[PDB]
Design a protein around this ligand. Structure first.
Ligand code: ZN
Ligand code: ZN
Lengths: 364, 472, 250, 95
């Protein structure tokens, strides 16, 4: 099947958000207009200044589009001159330099009183999350005594889309750029009808995480899986997780096999195993997504969490898989595919432990 | 908890650079070269509020274990000796189990403090530190004759050894310097005697190590060599004459009067010939400016750099400035230039790319290797033991350095332009005072660093590093 | 409109001496003014190199050409055209404020008033530069002028931010410019003694731990924070990194 | 009648001299130095050019002017640092 695309975080189009015009603004990509032959991938200094501004602006718009909210929130800086009055506000949640709980807004920041807080259950209240706070200001100190707390509500796809009609964000039919802005809804229903048929024939199957290509048991199980699968090749096949059980890094000894050479060797055997499943190699495209401790990250992260827009698998260590198979694509850890009428995103990392270890504590 | 990313851990992981001391100049006093060994073991054995501190109990236990190993190795145990030798390599290597980066940083910090304390102790007596490192120390001696420094050097080293904090150090004297022209680790020339003998005049040999010579035109390097030899001879002659007679020192003053007129006539002849034969096609070979890794200056007239280097080498006197300046102005008058012009300013004809904590498996030698300034046939082999290095290891180390550099740039802090206070809020347009945010790590610095990585990778055969570049 | 150029006593500003006995003007006269700029002289040799460059260029042998290019590239306009433009803008437009700008101005005024009070209660003498309602009128008129510059019949947040920035520059340069003027110093030397003993060179500690310890002791928070930030201002032994969490002893 | 003109003067020499005088000065001593002294150097050079009835300033007049200014600054210091400053400033007025 044609008319579907897979895209990585590297080639995603840039669109800024303007709070004074309440509209998304296209941003030219540095590669297309710039030279890019020396160093074009290095972001500018003000980018990190404006990143949190952009996130806050988007969250503010999303909150204010809600049906219930038409009471109105108040910016933080407008809380200096009043006391013993209830308010409502939202912003970043973090720890101040002193070590207290604070809410940060583009206007300013305040302190938080937690001794009598009743939070809305069902949320992982974590530092770095937009939160809605209802409380009473007190000018005797600087404590905003909180009595209730809840995360903002969400919206479905169609309602958020119609606010910009149907903008060409993941543009496959057409794209927008600096000169013009483009939209399309005529072929959406046609492609929906097309997708409604022969969808059972276009199946895509995914595997588990961290399939280490060094141990014998994983290879045997994978061989059995491919034995069952080669008869009926799917449309897309995805392997997620790390492909090596030990992070690759500097080897201080030259007596033994270099870890980089071992990493190269592990994928070479996979090419050999592909030789006995020719139907799968011939009919199904292949997708590989890097794991936490693969080549580039583990070089500096040593298996720990690092930069999220992770680089793809280097070409120099995949010079045989590309030649055996006919359709293999390496993408970033967050990757987006564009189907006929579906948007699919894949993201591999650790979530439950992170949210469990950093849960905020509520006295009661 | 160790799986999470934390800033202080990130900064202690990549804090691998080691400082050094270099004091350029021309010295007429004798200078001795010494080597320092067993530094890490002596540093370890000698010596709530802070969260970055390593556990005290484990440190004490390790110190006691090392002390008993030292004692057992003293009583003719080869295994204990091998263990003592391999302890440092175990400490540095992350592949070993029970490895903590905090302990490595603690050892590095203690080594820093011990080295600065040793430098201070050497400075307590009459001494001037010319160069410093983890392996080499050069000390300026007060006296003028190498024959007179025998008892002095022996007493000094004995007193250093008897110091309780320097009890376990191993000190060796390698060379004695008669007259030195020191400006850099890789660029010096002087007269040296290996070791002082008795009742006989010592053997003096001349050394000439100058990377700056490589960046000259092919036809002027012989002239540079000859004139360096002549000026060294003149300085030796004037020092000998002054010593025979008995911040200025008459040991060297008046040395340029020997070779002024021949130098001027030769410069005039060179200028005339260059003017005559610069545009000829068959003579275009010898005027080609060579290209080397780390070269960044783009300049046209070769004779200008020849005379600029030949004057900058003399200007290092720090005591005969005026005579050198008069000679330089007279030389520049041959050209149609002026004394303080920009084009008549000397610069470093090469950049630097240093890899710290490079280890040799066969010899357990630790040194920082420079990929740009260092000459060939030394990157590939260890200094003490003449064993070839693995190349994919070099490529991997370069890649790791580059990636750590990029990460450090990406995790930098923000500083206000007017008042240098640091940013303390997640979202804010500017400082409460006047001024706009600027980054602690400027962009052009990392751009130049990547440029020199490109040049280095292009010069030699480095394919995986090229692939690492390509993915960007 | 009044424009005045004045020199302080003893010529140079003499920062070592208190601001109170550096300016002879009374409180009444300064209040009428609303932009006061302290033009200090500095020596860093890079601004000096640039200024020498500019002066030798502006020497009549060179600048007579270069300034001409500013009228040929459209970067700068002639004086008389500027005169006609200013008279036309004065006659034509007269902008007005918007409620959001009013709220922002109110909050900013409250903030600066609170800061003045917090400085005064520390220094325990009256500020030599006052902040009153006339300064609020000043910011309002600055915003009005900014909007008037572009002939926009209304003033919005774009002009308000610039006006507040200019006012903060012209008030932080003069009023809050070291309001202390340089428990006494006894706790300062006791404070410096302990951290030197307890905290060696190369490591770091959390701000919260230090504050907790020295509030538990007699130092308390008011004395420690000023002492810590002045030891930082000494800028020879202690450095800040990773926001306000890490106290690095260089 | 005579009006000198100033074209071929050393940019970097005068710039470095002014930077050096900005250094030291109040930062180490007491005497104040401002941009007006640079204009004073230029005017002294122009006067020296006037002395010979020449329309164009030559380098020798610039040397004489810089010598006069640096000497006037040098001989107005304490005897503790006079010799040190004198040997420090010997490179601009080399002659
Ligand atoms: Zn070796
Ligand atoms: Zn600032």
């Amino acid at each position: 099947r044609d008319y579907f695309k897979v895209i990585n975080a590297s080639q995603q189009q840039r669109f800024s958000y303007n709070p004074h015009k309440m509209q998304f603004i296209f941003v030219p990509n540095k590669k297309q207009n710039g030279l890019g032959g020396i160093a074009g991938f290095l972001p500018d200094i003000e980018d990190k200044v404006q990143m949190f501004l952009t996130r806050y602006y988007l969250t503010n718009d999303r909150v204010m589009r809600n049906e219930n909210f038409q009471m109105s929130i108040t910016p933080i800086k407008n809380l200096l001159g009043r006391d013993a009055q209830n308010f409502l506000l939202l912003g970043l949640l973090n720890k101040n330099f002193k070590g207290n709980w604070s809410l940060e807004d583009p206007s300013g920041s305040v302190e938080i009183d937690i001794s009598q807080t009743i939070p809305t259950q069902g949320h992982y209240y974590v530092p770095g999350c937009m939160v809605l706070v209802e409380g009473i200001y007190y000018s005797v100190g600087n404590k905003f005594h909180v009595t209730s707390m809840t995360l903002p509500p969400g919206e479905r796809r169609e309602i958020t889309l119609e606010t910009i009609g149907n903008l060409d964000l993941l543009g496959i039919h057409g794209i927008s750029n600096n000169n013009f802005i483009a939209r399309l809804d005529k072929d959406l229903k046609i492609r929906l009808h097309l997708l409604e048929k022969e969808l059972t024939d276009h199946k895509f199957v995914i595997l588990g995480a961290n399939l280490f290509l060094d141990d014998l048991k994983i290879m045997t199980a994978l061989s059995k899986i491919l034995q069952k699968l080669n008869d009926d090749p799917p449309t897309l096949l995805i392997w997620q997780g790390s492909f090596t059980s030990v992070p690759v890094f500097a080897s201080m000894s030259s007596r033994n096999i270099s870890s980089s050479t071992q990493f190269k060797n592990n994928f070479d055997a996979l090419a050999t195993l592909l030789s006995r499943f020719d139907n799968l190699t011939e009919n199904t495209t292949m997708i590989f997504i890097p794991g936490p401790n693969d080549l580039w990250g583990s070089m500096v992260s040593l298996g720990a969490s690092g930069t999220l827009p992770q680089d793809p698998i280097p070409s120099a260590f995949t010079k045989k898989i590309n030649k055996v198979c006919k359709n293999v694509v390496w993408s970033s850890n967050p990757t987006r595919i564009a189907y006929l009428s579906q948007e699919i995103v894949i993201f591999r990392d650790d979530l439950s432990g992170r949210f469990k270890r950093h849960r905020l504590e509520f006295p009661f | 908890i160790q799986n999470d990313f934390d800033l202080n851990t990130s900064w202690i992981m990549n804090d691998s650079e080691f400082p050094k001391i270099n004091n350029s100049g021309v010295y007429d006093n004798v200078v001795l070269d010494v080597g320092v060994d067993n530094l890490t073991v002596n540093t370890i054995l000698t010596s709530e509020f802070v969260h970055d501190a390593f556990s005290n109990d484990a440190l004490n236990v390790l110190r006691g274990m090392l002390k008993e190993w030292w004692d057992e190795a003293l009583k003719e145990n080869s295994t204990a000796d091998l263990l003592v030798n391999s302890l440092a390599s175990w400490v540095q290597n992350p592949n070993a189990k029970l490895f903590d980066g905090l302990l490595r940083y603690h050892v590095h910090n203690l080594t820093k403090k011990a080295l600065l304390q040793l430098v201070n102790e050497f400075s307590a007596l009459g001494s001037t530190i010319v160069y410093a490192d983890r392996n080499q120390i050069l000390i300026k001696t007060n006296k003028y004759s190498p024959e007179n420094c025998y008892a002095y050097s022996q007493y000094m080293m004995k007193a250093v050894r008897t110091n309780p904090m320097f009890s376990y150090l191993d000190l060796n004297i390698k060379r004695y310097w008669d007259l030195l022209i020191w400006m850099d680790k890789f660029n010096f020339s002087g007269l040296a005697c290996i070791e002082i003998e008795e009742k006989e005049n010592q053997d003096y040999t001349a050394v000439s190590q100058w990377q700056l010579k490589k960046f000259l035109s092919p036809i002027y390097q012989p002239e540079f060599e000859d004139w360096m030899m002549i000026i060294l001879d003149s300085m030796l002659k004037t020092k000998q004459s002054y010593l025979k007679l008995n911040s200025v020192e008459n040991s060297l003053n008046g040395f340029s009067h020997l070779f002024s007129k021949p130098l001027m006539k030769r410069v005039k002849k060179l200028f005339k010939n260059q003017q005559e034969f610069i545009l000829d096609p068959q003579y275009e070979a010898d005027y080609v400016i060579p290209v080397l890794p780390g070269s960044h200056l783009n300049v046209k007239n070769p004779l200008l750099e020849l005379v600029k280097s030949l004057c900058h080498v003399m200007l290092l006197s720090k005591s005969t400035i005026l005579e050198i300046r008069t000679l330089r102005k007279e030389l520049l008058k041959i050209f149609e230039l002026r004394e303080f012009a920009k084009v008549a300013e000397f610069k470093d004809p090469s950049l630097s790319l240093v890899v710290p904590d490079f280890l040799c498996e066969y010899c357990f030698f630790i040194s920082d290797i420079d990929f740009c300034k260092a000459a060939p046939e030394s990157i590939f082999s260890c200094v003490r033991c003449h064993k070839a290095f693995n190349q994919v290891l070099l490529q991997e180390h370069l890649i790791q350095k580059l990636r750590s550099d990029i990460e450090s740039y990406l995790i930098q802090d923000l500083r206000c332009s007017r008042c240098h206070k640091v940013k303390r809020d997640y979202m804010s347009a500017h400082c409460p005072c006047a001024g706009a945010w600027e980054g602690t790590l400027p962009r052009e610095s990392i751009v130049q660093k990547l440029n020199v990585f490109k040049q280095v990778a292009k010069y030699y055969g480095f394919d995986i590093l090229l692939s690492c570049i390509a993915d960007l | 409109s009044v424009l005045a150029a004045a020199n302080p006593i003893y010529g140079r500003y003499d920062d070592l001496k208190s601001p109170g006995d550096n300016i002879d003007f009374q409180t009444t006269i300064l209040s009428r003014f609303d932009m006061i700029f302290i033009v200090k002289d500095d020596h860093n040799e890079e601004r000096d190199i640039s200024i020498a460059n500019h002066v030798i260029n502006i020497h009549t042998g060179n600048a007579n050409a270069m300034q001409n290019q500013q009228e040929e590239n459209g970067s700068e306009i002639s004086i008389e055209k500027m005169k006609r433009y200013i008279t036309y803008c004065r006659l034509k437009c007269a902008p007005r404020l918007s409620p959001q700008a009013a709220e922002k101005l109110s909050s900013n005024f409250v903030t600066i008033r609170k800061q003045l009070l917090i400085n005064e209660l520390e220094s325990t003498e009256r500020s030599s530069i006052p902040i009153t309602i006339r300064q609020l009128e000043a910011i309002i008129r600055i915003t009005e002028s900014l909007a008037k510059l572009e002939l926009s019949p209304i003033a919005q947040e774009r002009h308000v931010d610039e006006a507040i920035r200019l006012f903060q520059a012209s008030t932080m340069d003069a009023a809050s410019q070291d309001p202390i003027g340089g428990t006494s110093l006894s706790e300062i030397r006791r404070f410096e003694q302990e951290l030197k003993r307890r905290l060696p060179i190369g490591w770091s500690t959390s701000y919260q731990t230090l504050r907790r310890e020295f509030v538990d002791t007699h130092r308390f928070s008011q004395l420690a924070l000023d002492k810590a930030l002045y030891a930082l201002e000494k800028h020879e032994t202690i450095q800040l990194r990773h926001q306000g969490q890490n106290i690095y002893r260089s | 009648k005579i009006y000198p003109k100033l074209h071929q003067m050393d940019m970097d020499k005068v710039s470095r001299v002014y930077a050096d005088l900005r250094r030291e000065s109040i930062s180490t001593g007491s005497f104040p130095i401002t941009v007006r002294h640079l204009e004073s150097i230029l005017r002294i050079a122009e006067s020296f050019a006037k002395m010979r009835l020449s329309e164009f300033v030559s380098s020798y007049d610039l040397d004489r002017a810089i010598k006069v200014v640096v000497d006037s600054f040098v001989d107005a210091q304490k005897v503790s640092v006079r010799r040190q400053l004198r040997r420090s400033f010997a490179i601009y007025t080399l002659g």
